[PDB]
């Protein structure tokens, strides 16, 4: 869901 950030893409 929080895939809208380079450090959150691998967190979505």
Curated annotation (Swiss-Prot):
Q: List the disulfide bonds.
A: 2-8, 2-12, 3-8, 3-12
Tissue-wise expression: Expressed by the venom duct.
Where does the record place the site Important for binding to human alpha-7 nAChR? 5-7, 9-10
Its domain of life? Eukaryota
Q: Where Cysteine amide occurs, residue numbers?
A: 12
Query: Which keywords accompany this UniProt record?
Result: Acetylcholine receptor inhibiting toxin, Amidation, Cleavage on pair of basic residues, Disulfide bond, Ion channel impairing toxin, Neurotoxin, Postsynaptic neurotoxin, Secreted, Toxin
Output the Gene Ontology terms for molecular function. Answer: acetylcholine receptor inhibitor activity; ion channel regulator activity; toxin activity
Which compartments is it annotated to reside in?
Secreted
Annotated effect of mutating residue 5 to L: Reduction of toxicity
Effect of mutating residue 6 to R? Loss of ability to compete with alpha-bungarotoxin
Keyword Disulfide bond set for record = yes
Which post-translational modifications are recorded for this protein?
Not hydroxylated. Hydroxylation improves its folding but impairs its activity against target receptors.
TM annotation in the entry: none
Q: Main localization of the protein?
A: secreted
Tell me more from the record.
This toxin is a substrate for a multienzyme complex that regulates its folding and assembly. This complex is composed of protein-disulfide isomerase (PDI), peptidyl-prolyl cis-trans isomerase (PPI) and immunoglobulin-binding protein (BiP). PDI catalyzes the oxidation and reduction of disulfide bonds. Oxidative folding rates are further increased in the presence of PPI with the maximum effect observed in the presence of both enzymes. In contrast, BiP is only observed to assist folding in the presence of microsomes, suggesting that additional cofactors are involved. Negative results: does not inhibit alpha-2-beta-2, alpha-4-beta-2, alpha-2-beta-4, alpha-3-beta-4, and alpha-4-beta-4 subunits. Also has no effect on muscle nAChRs alpha-1-beta-1-delta-epsilon.
Query: What task does this protein carry out?
Result: Alpha-conotoxins act on postsynaptic membranes, they bind to the nicotinic acetylcholine receptors (nAChR) and thus inhibit them. This toxin blocks neuronal alpha-3-beta-2/CHRNA3-CHRNB2 (human and rat), alpha-7/CHRNA7 (human and rat), and alpha-3-beta-4/CHRNA3-CHRNB4 (human) nAChRs. Acts voltage-independently. Competes with alpha-bungarotoxin for binding to the receptor. Binds to a different site than alpha-conotoxin ImII. Is highly active against the neuromuscular receptor in frog. Also exhibits inhibition of D.melanogaster alpha-7 nAChRs.
Name of the molecule in the record: Alpha-conotoxin ImI
The top of its lineage is: Eukaryota, Metazoa, Spiralia, Lophotrochozoa, Mollusca
Q: Which residues of the full protein are shown?
A: 5 to 16 of 17
């Amino acid at each position: 869901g929080x895939x809208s950030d380079p450090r959150x893409a691998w967190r979505x």
